[PDB]
Design a protein around this nucleic acid. Structure first.
Ligand SMILES: [Mg+2]
Ligand SMILES: [Zn+2]
Ligand SMILES: [Zn+2]
Ligand SMILES: [Zn+2]
Lengths: 115, 49, 98, 67, 51, 392, 259, 45, 22, 82, 154, 51, 253
RNA sequence: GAUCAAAAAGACAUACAUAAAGACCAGGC
């Protein structure tokens, strides 16, 4: 009777922003992103792309609680590199990886069939 | 006629004694049903040793 | 109406003497699982009052080998006072010693 | 009651392999050879057909409400 | 000496390690019945007229 | 499945389970308990690992993608009966759809669901307090009423309602005559109960525990072959409880999923050793002790310690969370004490007893304890004379 | 500070199965791929069921359960259909859903099996999968019993309900012979070797590699029959890149709005 | 008015309020309620 | 008991100080 | 008793500080003047807890000695434990 | 249609001052006890809100010049009490304008036509000016939906 | 036994004299526990002058 | 709310809590809290009493809150301590062997709620940077809290001879200045006993700083245990073929 | 010669008070 709807995990209702950016006062150049209606699929890709960036000192995510679906990503970069720039370059670098993987998987298919 | 005695199910005096599988289904009884209980006012009572 | 009464309610005896009469015979049979029925139809009840803290009637006794299940027993106040029967055990129906 | 579609763990379809699995047993296959002919490699699927209990054949003995 | 009371609820317990020590998960249907009378002031009247 | 004719039987409280399975490791005397015909349980792949911490204490984590496929998904039948009767000389009871205008006692529950004869047809969903059987009693007070013209309400409504917070679809309805010859009607409502995170599962070895949480097949730790545990139980259950036959069943039944034979668990053999099992398990390409290498489900990485997985036979228990849940705010009240009613079906209040009021003499909270024994329960006022002390 | 460039080698390709080997990738990117093979690959599966007359021994929502789990051929038009929630029209149209019909009555004395072959679709494209190998069994009928119902199939994906998983078990393995030491064997000699092992029967484990990090991520992707296994993968990548292109958008609108 | 199904011969008979319950062509006293006409719509979930 | 052992009185002299909006 | 010769602990027992922050918050919750500057506070318990650390609460505590006498301690004169 | 106030008790009957200002005799059982609306509000001759317990002056009609306490209100009528009035135990009735202060949807089967629940069939438990409560036939639950989403079926 | 120990002691309380007194004002102890210290803040220690 | 389980044996079985509203049907409570109530999760139930006024709600908050009742007047020990997997994981987390790479530190630090923002410098700087479990656990320990306990396996011959402070087996626990220098934690340090690392927190720091102490150990060592995992298996209940001969020859003897 | 009104949103008109007691029996922690 209290079971939440199945669709409630990936669907946003009125008023919920997808992303919420809040600066972090503990630290200089630290920012904390809040992603609604996402899980470890999306959060883990980005964290692991941020740690390749040598100008990123810290990156990590957590699901605060499993029953509510949101991600919280802290990022701390070096001075004169903004943590919002770090998080955008991460997303464009995956897109430039996954667009290279979808093209290389199509070539191996045609090679595989009758070849 | 002095009275009526409740009858344990599947005893020698039940109507289900000696019936086969096919007949127990036409009568809507489970063939796996062990028996040995009473029907009093519709509930199924078990004398406990 | 006399039999049908004492099988129905479970107070076993006369209805006006029900105070003196033993209670708890003939429960409604249990329909949960098919194996909650087979262990209801085969069961043994010690008449001893459930309240008593005396532990001698409860303890498992060497004479229960093979004729009563050692493991199966309720818990709570009824521990060891109610006992299931072993598989092979067959209670004797009686005869005449003529 | 009746064999599940979709093996619980992995999600492969065992729904359609039951009536084909009774055929192999009556051909004197052993349940190891039967389940390999049906092509069920993982033991998550091999426990659907092997541990199944078919009550839909018992329940069809009773007559329906309507003729 | 003791008596049945209102504003009480009973249900099963299951672990959530993501909580603090002093928190507790309360389901939404057990939290919808049980009410807390709140005195209106000029501070909260904006929030309570919405409730 | 309790009896095979259950579709015919009308019994209050009949649980039944969609997909039973006979076990993979089975005592040789189950054949004479007819437990292959009427099995209660399902096999499940069971990791024994501490995973997210939600399975600690006796809880169990479950796979939610399994629960979506019919795993432990069951049906709960509930049966109602109401008996028309002729009691007073003029006083008759009848099954009829009540009208707000003629009938007296009425509630705002929908009566549109009743047929012409005052019985829900089967296949009509009804939730708590929806009206299953309209039954009106003719009010003999109309005779007691003298020169009251034509009383607006001649008929009182005795109608029976679904038990509160019981939702379900009316499965079957039947109309017969009882002993006496009055019309008599039983009605069977059912509802399908999907295993939630409150429900209660137990193996054959005495390991009982609720569901901690449900992860989807994504989030579950998987083997090298893509097998994910339907159920994960905490390893700490084993050492102090010492059910090892739970560890051998997961072992004996992993050889009996592979070989295709249903293993032999019968208690006393000397023909079955943990050592003679393991040598059969090493031949199918598994580590002989049953440990198996897992990958973390969330992050993809291997889990350092090897985890012990095998098919194991679990039972779902009559005890579900939906039937144990209760909440009370200013409801019905007892007649004599003017205190809240007793019991869950009555919207009754929970008891604040002796041991509890002795714990709050300990806390030294006087104003929680006066409110708990006075204000939340019946408050009341008396007028007491000053000279005598008695009421006035 | 930039994305690595992976490569793919397809080893086995059949109608039930795909084995590919992805190299030069993170552990986290390689995972999130297989973690999309389950959830987010869209598929068509029955959702709204309407039961006109059911005389079978199985109650209504028990049959409405088995129908959902039946796989439907999603090969192409999944791209064309719109989610029913986004679709503007009232109720169901040809654009958001497919209509199925099952009218079955048992006249004969013999026990009739209602099989998924009896689902009759308004469109030739999507049918039950076995119709494209015995047929899935919905229910059995004694003489006199009748089951007729109408069911609209929708588009969805595996996060909602497990009946939209396009795939059977998706295998994943990396570093089969253990160099990285992500898992530490107490006795290394008792463990069987992976299919992918490069080691002779003599030695148990590869020697420890301090600098290494996991690469060569071995997959096996086995379809349920809805989507041919080659296009379970193309739909996962194209469906992960669409969630990352939904972020860069709604992040850019916030950085521009906040500043 | 109200169509009921005999539990023995399975012949629908039309019998109305304030009538004893006996099916014609059997004599069997147990009647069933047939099934409702109104729309039932399920999720395949 | 505790919380009931003592009795609270309102100090009338102190209420006359402090900046008080409501 | 006199202001001299008071015999009681100067500290505020955890029972007194529990009923002071309760009684004060009940006043604040009904239109009562607030002694301390409130900044972003709509909750009375947080306001009354704030008045306490500043020792602004206008309450005198009457402590009954067990022999029937009593003492009157103002909430400023007592020393807050926490 | 007619309400009144009991102004005399007799062994078998009451004398009742009806809302028109006439006193009638009725058997105890010929009248039904009416639930008094202690929170009723009306307008006086100067458009003031008046309530039960208010003291009003009568400025028109038969009792013009009198003063009384409002005891009961019903539609266009006020039953007043003045202890100086010996008639009818002090009770009298005045028009309020002669004084101066001194659902159809519920039960239907609807189909949710928009939003995340689109397609579910249900029956309305409660209707509101805004959000009806639909009782879902598919699952066990009741949901609140804007009434723009619902569509009645047959 | 837990119920008997409570009903006999229930009203004993530490008065503002710090003398422990039951409900009648009769003196059970001159100071609580003879040292007059609440039991939750104490620890174990060695004397080290002894032995 | 006040929160109860019958029978209430002592006063730790009624403790005030702070509601957080979550789906499904069951009350949910931290696992350290299952020590006072003496409740394991198998079909248990617990009452809930919602106090109805600000005046009685400020009694619960300043008297019966769970962070206040950490230390019991009965035995003058802490009631609540680390329990179940976490107390097994702490030990496995605290051995000398445990070396956390740079990727697995970023996650653990993310679950520290009290973390002051500064990533501590690895114990091993080169060839590859590796933090230690004792090095990360020392960020959990609040304030400057100081303890000496001893591990359960601590041999008695160790304190007497050479290697008192080098401790070959790493048994002796030292905490100096809120930093875990040496030793393995166990029931005798994180558990409930007089003088445990938890009991010194509540005494020296306070009831507020020790609330964030439990919630950090549980969240950062439960989300670490997903890397190591834990199990019981048949391989762990079995001895050598040589030990089975020594167990018989003692029985026959 | 003058004059020539329509029944005002019904709120279980609200406590949903069906919740007999009393008893035994079964189970839960
Ligand atoms: Mg327990
Ligand atoms: Zn499978
Ligand atoms: Zn007097
Ligand atoms: Zn007939």
């Amino acid at each position: 009777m209290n079971a939440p709807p199945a669709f409630e995990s990936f669907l946003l209702f009125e008023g919920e922003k997808k992303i919420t950016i809040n600066k972090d006062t503990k630290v200089p150049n630290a920012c904390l992103f809040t992603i609604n209606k996402e899980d470890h699929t999306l959060g883990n890709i980005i964290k692991s792309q941020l740690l390749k960036d040598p100008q990123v000192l810290f990156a990590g995510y957590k699901v605060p609680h499993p029953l509510e679906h949101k991600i919280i990503i802290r990022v701390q970069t070096t001075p004169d590199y903004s943590p919002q720039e770090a998080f955008t370059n991460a997303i464009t670098d995956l897109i430039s990886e996954l667009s290279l993987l979808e093209e290389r998987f199509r070539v191996a298919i045609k090679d595989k069939q009758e070849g | 006629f002095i009275g009526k005695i409740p009858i344990m199910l599947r005893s020698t005096y039940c109507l289900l004694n000696g019936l086969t599988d096919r007949d127990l289904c036409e009568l809507n009884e489970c063939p796996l049903d062990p028996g040995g209980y009473f029907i009093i006012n519709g509930s199924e009572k078990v004398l406990i040793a | 109406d006399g039999l049908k009464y004492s099988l129905a309610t479970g107070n076993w005896g006369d209805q006006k003497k029900a105070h003196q009469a033993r209670a708890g015979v003939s429960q409604v049979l249990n329909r949960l699982t098919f194996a909650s029925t087979l262990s209801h139809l085969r069961r043994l009840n010690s008449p001893i009052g459930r309240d008593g803290k005396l532990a001698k009637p409860r303890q498992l006794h060497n004479t229960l080998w093979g004729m009563v299940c050692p493991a199966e027993t309720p818990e709570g106040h009824a521990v060891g006072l109610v006992k299931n029967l072993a598989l092979m055990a067959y209670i004797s129906v009686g005869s005449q010693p003529s | 009651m009746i064999i599940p579609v979709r093996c619980f763990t992995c999600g492969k379809i065992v729904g359609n392999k039951w009536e084909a699995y009774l055929g192999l047993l009556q051909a004197e296959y052993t349940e190891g050879d039967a389940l390999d002919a049906l092509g069920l490699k993982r033991y998550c699927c091999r426990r659907m057909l092997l541990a199944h209990v078919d009550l839909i054949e018992k329940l069809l003995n009773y007559a329906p409400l309507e003729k | 000496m003791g008596k049945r009371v209102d504003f009480s609820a009973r249900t099963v317990i299951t672990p959530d390690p993501n909580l603090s020590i002093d928190q507790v998960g309360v389901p939404r249907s057990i939290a919808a019945n049980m009410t807390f009378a709140e005195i209106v002031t000029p501070f909260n009247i904006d929030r309570l007229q919405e409730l | 499945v309790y009896i095979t004719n259950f579709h015919v039987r009308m019994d209050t409280l009949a649980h039944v389970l969609y997909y039973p399975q006979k076990p993979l490791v089975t005592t040789r005397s189950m054949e004479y308990l007819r437990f292959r015909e009427l099995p209660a349980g399902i096999n499940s792949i069971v990791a024994i690992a501490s995973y997210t911490g939600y399975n600690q204490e006796d809880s169990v984590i479950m796979n939610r993608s399994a629960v979506d496929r019919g795993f432990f998904r069951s049906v709960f039948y509930r049966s109602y009966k109401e008996q028309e009767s002729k009691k007073g000389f003029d006083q008759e009871e009848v099954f009829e759809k009540p009208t707000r205008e003629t009938c007296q006692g009425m509630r705002h529950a929908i009566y549109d669901k009743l047929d012409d004869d005052g019985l829900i047809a089967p296949g009509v969903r009804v939730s708590g307090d929806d009206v299953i059987i309209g039954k009106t009693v003719t009010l003999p007070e109309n005779e007691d009423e003298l020169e009251g013209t034509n009383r607006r309400y001649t008929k009182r409504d005795c109608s029976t309602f679904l038990r509160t917070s019981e939702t379900g679809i009316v499965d079957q309805v039947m109309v017969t005559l009882n002993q006496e010859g009055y019309k008599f009607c039983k009605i069977r409502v059912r509802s399908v109960r999907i295993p939630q995170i409150g429900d209660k599962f137990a193996s054959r070895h005495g390991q009982k525990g609720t569901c901690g949480i449900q992860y989807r097949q994504e989030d579950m730790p998987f083997t090298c072959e893509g097998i994910t545990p339907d159920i994960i139980i905490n390893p700490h259950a084993i050492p102090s409880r010492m059910t090892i036959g739970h560890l051998i069943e997961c072992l004996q039944g992993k050889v009996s999923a592979n070989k295709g034979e249903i293993g032999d668990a019968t208690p006393f053999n000397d023909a079955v050793n943990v050592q003679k099992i393991s040598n059969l398990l090493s031949d199918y390409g598994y580590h002989l002790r049953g440990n198996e290498v897992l990958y973390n489900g969330f992050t993809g990485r291997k889990i350092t310690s090897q985890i012990f997985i095998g098919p194991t036979y679990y039972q779902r228990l009559k005890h579900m969370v939906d039937d144990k849940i209760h909440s009370r705010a200013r409801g019905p009240i007892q007649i004599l004490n003017r205190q809240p009613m007793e019991g869950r079906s009555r919207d009754g209040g929970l008891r604040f007893g002796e041991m509890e009021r002795d714990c709050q003499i300990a806390h030294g909270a006087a104003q929680f304890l006066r409110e708990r024994l006075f204000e939340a329960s019946d408050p009341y006022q008396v007028h007491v004379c000053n000279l005598c002390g008695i009421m006035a | 500070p930039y994305a690595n460039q992976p490569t793919v080698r397809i080893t086995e390709l059949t109608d039930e199965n795909v084995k590919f080997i992805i190299e030069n990738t993170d552990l986290a990117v390689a995972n999130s791929i297989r973690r999309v093979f389950i959830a987010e690959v869209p598929i068509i599966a029955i959702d709204w069921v309407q039961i006109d007359a059911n005389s079978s021994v199985l109650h209504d929502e028990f049959i409405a359960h088995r129908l959902g789990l039946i796989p439907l051929t999603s090969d192409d038009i999944v791209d064309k259909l719109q989610y029913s929630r986004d679709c503007t029209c009232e109720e169901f149209c040809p654009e958001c859903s497919v209509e199925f019909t099952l009218d079955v009555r048992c006249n004969e004395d013999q026990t009739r099996h209602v099989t998924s072959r009896d689902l009759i679709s308004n469109s030739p494209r999507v049918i039950p999968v076995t119709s494209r190998q015995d047929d899935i069994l919905i229910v059995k009928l004694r003489k006199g019993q009748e089951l007729r119902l109408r069911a609209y199939a929708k588009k969805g994906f595996g996060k909602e309900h497990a009946k939209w998983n396009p795939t059977a078990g998706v295998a994943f393995e990396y570093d089969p012979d253990n160099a990285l030491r992500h898992t530490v064997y107490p006795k290394p000699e008792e463990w069987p070797k992976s299919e992918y092992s490069e080691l002779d029967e003599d030695e148990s484990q590869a020697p420890y590699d301090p600098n290494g990090k996991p690469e060569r991520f071995y997959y096996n992707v086995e379809s349920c029959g809805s989507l041919r296994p080659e296009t379970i993968v193309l739909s996962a990548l194209s469906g992960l890149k669409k969630k990352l292109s939904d972020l860069q958008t709604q992040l850019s609108h916030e950085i521009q709005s906040d500043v | 008015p109200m169509i009921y199904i005999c539990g023995e011969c399975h012949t629908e008979n039309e019998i109305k309020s304030r009538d004893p319950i006996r099916c014609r062509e059997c004599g069997y006293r147990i009647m069933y309620k047939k099934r409702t006409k109104r729309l039932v719509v399920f999720d395949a979930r | 008991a505790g919380t009931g052992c003592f009795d609270l009185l309102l100090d009338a002299e102190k209420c006359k100080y402090g900046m008080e909006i409501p | 008793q006199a202001n001299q010769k008071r015999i009681t602990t100067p500290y505020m027992t955890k029972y007194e500080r529990a009923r002071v922050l309760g009684t004060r918050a009940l006043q604040i919750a009904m239109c009562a003047p607030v002694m301390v500057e409130l900044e972003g506070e709509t909750d009375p318990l947080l306001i009354a807890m704030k008045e306490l650390k500043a020792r602004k609460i206008p309450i005198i505590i009457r402590r009954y000695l067990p022999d029937g006498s009593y003492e009157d301690w103002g909430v400023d004169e007592l020393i807050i434990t926490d | 249609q007619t309400v009144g106030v009991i102004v005399r008790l007799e062994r078998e009957t009451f004398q009742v001052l009806n809302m028109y200002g006439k006193v009638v005799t009725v058997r105890h059982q010929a009248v039904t006890r009416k639930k008094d609306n202690r929170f009723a509000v009306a307008l006086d001759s100067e458009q003031n809100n008046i309530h039960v317990k208010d003291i009003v002056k009568v400025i028109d009609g038969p009792h013009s010049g009198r003063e009384g306490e409002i005891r009961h209100l019903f539609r266009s009528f006020a039953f007043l009490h003045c202890k100086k009035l010996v008639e009818n135990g002090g009770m009298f009735v005045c028009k309020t304008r002669h004084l101066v202060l001194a659902n159809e949807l519920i039960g239907q089967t609807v189909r949710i036509s928009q939003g995340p629940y689109k397609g579910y069939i249900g029956v309305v438990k409660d209707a509101t000016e805004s959000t009806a409560r639909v009782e879902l036939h598919s699952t066990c639950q009741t949901i609140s939906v804007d009434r723009q989403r619902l569509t009645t079926v047959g | 036994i837990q119920r008997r120990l409570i009903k006999s002691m229930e009203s004993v309380m530490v008065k503002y004299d710090a003398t422990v007194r039951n409900s009648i004002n009769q003196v059970v102890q001159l100071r609580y526990g003879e040292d007059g210290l609440a039991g939750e803040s104490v620890e174990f220690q060695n004397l080290a002058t002894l032995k | 709310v006040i929160f109860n389980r019958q029978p209430t044996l002592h006063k730790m079985s009624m403790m005030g809590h702070r509601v957080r509203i979550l789906p499904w049907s069951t009350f949910r409570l931290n696992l350290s809290v299952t020590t006072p109530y003496n409740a394991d999760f198998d079909g248990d139930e617990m009452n809930l009493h919602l106090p109805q006024s600000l005046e009685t709600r400020a009694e619960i908050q300043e008297l019966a809150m769970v962070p206040r009742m950490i230390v019991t007047p009965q035995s003058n020990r802490p009631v609540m301590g680390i329990v179940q997997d976490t107390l097994t994981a702490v030990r496995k987390f605290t051995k000398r062997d445990v070396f956390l790479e740079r990727g697995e530190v970023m996650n653990l630090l993310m679950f520290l709620s009290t973390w002051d923002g500064k990533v501590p410098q690895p114990a091993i700087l080169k060839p590859r940077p590796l933090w230690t479990g004792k090095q990360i656990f020392s960020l959990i320990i609040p304030g400057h809290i100081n303890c000496i306990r001893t591990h359960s396996t601590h041999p008695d011959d160790e304190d007497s001879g050479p290697y008192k402070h080098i401790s070959p087996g790493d048994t002796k626990v030292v905490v100096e200045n809120g930093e875990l220098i040496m030793g393995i934690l166990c029931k005798k340090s994180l558990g409930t006993s007089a003088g445990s690392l938890v009991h010194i927190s509540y005494l020296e720091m306070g009831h507020d700083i020790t609330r964030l102490f439990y919630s950090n150990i549980q969240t950062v060592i439960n989300n670490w245990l997903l890397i190591e995992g834990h199990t019981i298996g048949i391989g762990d209940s079995i001895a050598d073929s040589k030990t089975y001969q020594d167990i018989q020859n003692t029985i026959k003897k």
